[PDB]
Design a protein around this ligand. Structure first.
Ligand code: PLP
Ligand code: PLP
Ligand code: CL
Lengths: 336, 331
């Protein structure tokens, strides 16, 4: 080949992230959770694995030509990841997002060479941001649409990549996996990792996670704004197939923030969705038994969240799990 | 012990970058050090310093770790300090990017900003000694003089460099790195010279504040992480080859180009790229030059990196065009 050569080496920019064994007290019995740290990636997120897999398989299946624009609707880690990997592969990148999105998001995505097209309230969300991507393709037929919320390459990325890493590294510790939890944005993470884990541990519980403040998985709908950036921003996406998963876990965004704060104070600088996943995983442990082996992921680091409530004191509410959690140690770290 | 905590640092990607320089094709090789616990090369050094300190009982259980930083070292010691159960107290000049202050505080460290009136970098260092004098159990990693700093890079990143270039059957002709503490250049340089006695090991300075090359001149500059108002004891300019000098404007424009090609890096990464080119010009078109990208662009959104830089006539970046990533290695 040659393109094949290129894709073989560019994959060294993504994956092979640390697996961490985190020990903590939960009122006040000793527990542990296993977690992948996905900050160790090209642009700092799990979405790098997904963007790379997507573009690679698309090249393999001749579904994108050289120099073709990559076009998507997002303001988060997906725009960042396709912007960077798009530029690496010689593609201009076009991102549609709403016109009230913060300066910080726009500047970071702009840094990576993408063209940003802003959509107003009146031009329709949000939902109309994904509509203009479809318009663009019909007027420029070389357009590749990642279609993150519906594209099987997304879930597959995590089946072939991070999911397999998880099964391999838990097997090297001779630990069976009793469960896995992940917040759903596109759903690619929970679906892909779940498919992989359930091939190896048929009784594993694969629980998708939503915010209690906007339970898009349990109701179907975008109910309200919440502060768990990267998860449930729109509608149960087409990729998520709830029937193939076990029961929905719900976490309050404040509880996620406090948990992420605690994580940073033990030297793990993570995003709000990571704190959510940690709480998520503990909930699942609480259903299965204190000593069950539960895995999750930390999808990004804390550096993009330095003006969010991650930086402020959160009111502790009755039902927060995080008020009864004290982190003790990183007991082990695996890197394969 | 932490045979296992070392899995949080190091083993980062080596990139082969192809570019045009007015208007000839060239390449340089670069370690991407964002792929580390806190997103910087300093993670390697913080971990190694603490591991040795523990080995030689230079640090007591729960004792405070206290340090002066341009940002990344404090971030790194706040994260690793927290992991190992230590209070951390960081002094940092007040003109470093505000994202630095926020991250240090997120890791549970006490952060004290130090003004130019209060002596900037030299003042920050003295405040660390003051704290140690006042509080007898204090551990001072003293990154500006501690040989563990350069040792960390001799054993870690330096050895990865040598093995990665060996794997390409390529001889290293030169290495360039901006000097903050001097750890990076001294430690990598020692390792490279053991394997290529003729390789040139070049420290880099801002052209705006050429302290290494003059021995005295200190001025404001925006190349965060390097040129900290003095020549650090760790750096031995007579054991290194000649100083390379890059304009902070030229560095920023170069870091901006790198991000447009997919490599979101800090201002000093831009500086190092231009430096490695300036060295390449000395040794030949075809010479094999290695450098490092110490961190990513996320701590710099508040800085001139995100603004439109006045290009000048003498910027090498006005004549650079990035072509592609030709290769990526990682063991
Ligand atoms: C995208 C994203 C998620 C959700 O992952 P999906 O695979 O899209 O479900 C969680 N956290 C962060 C920070 C993200 O960017
Ligand atoms: C510390 C630092 C440097 C300089 O490295 P030394 O090993 O201290 O010479 C360069 N760039 C950045 C971003 C840094 O934090
Ligand atoms: Cl520093």
């Amino acid at each position: 080949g040659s393109e094949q050569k290129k894709m073989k080496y560019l994959e060294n920019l993504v994956g092979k992230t640390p697996m961490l064994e985190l020990i903590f007290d939960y009122k006040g019995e000793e527990r542990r959770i296993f977690v992948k740290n996905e900050s160790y990636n090209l642009t700092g997120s799990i979405k790098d694995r997904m963007a790379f897999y997507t573009l690679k398989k698309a090249y393999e299946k001749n579904e994108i030509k050289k120099g073709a624009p990559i076009v998507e609707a997002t303001s988060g880690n997906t725009g960042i990841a396709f912007s960077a990997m798009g530029a690496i592969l010689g593609h201009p990148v076009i991102i549609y997002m709403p016109d009230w999105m913060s300066e910080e998001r726009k500047s970071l995505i702009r840094s990576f060479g993408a063209k940003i097209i802003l959509v107003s309230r009146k031009e329709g969300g949000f939902l109309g941001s994904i509509e203009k991507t479809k318009e663009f393709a019909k007027n420029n037929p070389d357009t590749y649409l990642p279609s993150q919320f519906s594209n099987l390459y997304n879930s597959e990325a995590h089946y072939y990549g991070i999911g397999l890493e998880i099964v391999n590294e838990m097997k090297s510790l001779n630990l069976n996996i009793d469960g896995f939890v992940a917040g759903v944005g596109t759903g690619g993470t929970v679906m892909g990792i779940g498919k992989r884990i359930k091939e190896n541990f048929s009784n594993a519980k694969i629980c998708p996670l939503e915010p209690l403040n906007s339970p898009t998985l349990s109701t179907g709908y975008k109910v309200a704004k919440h502060r768990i950036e990267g998860i449930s921003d729109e509608f149960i996406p087409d990729l998520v197939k709830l029937d193939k998963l076990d029961n929905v876990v719900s976490v309050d965004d404040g509880d996620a923030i406090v948990m992420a704060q605690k994580l940073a104070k033990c030297g793990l600088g993570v995003g709000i969705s990571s704190g959510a996943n940690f709480i998520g995983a503990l909930m699942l442990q609480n259903k299965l038994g204190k000593d069950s082996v539960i895995v999750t992921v930390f999808p990004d680091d804390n550096k993009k969240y330095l003006s969010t409530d991650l930086m402020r004191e959160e009111k502790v509410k009755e039902d927060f799990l995080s008020k009864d959690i004290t982190l003790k140690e990183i007991k082990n770290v695996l890197r394969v």
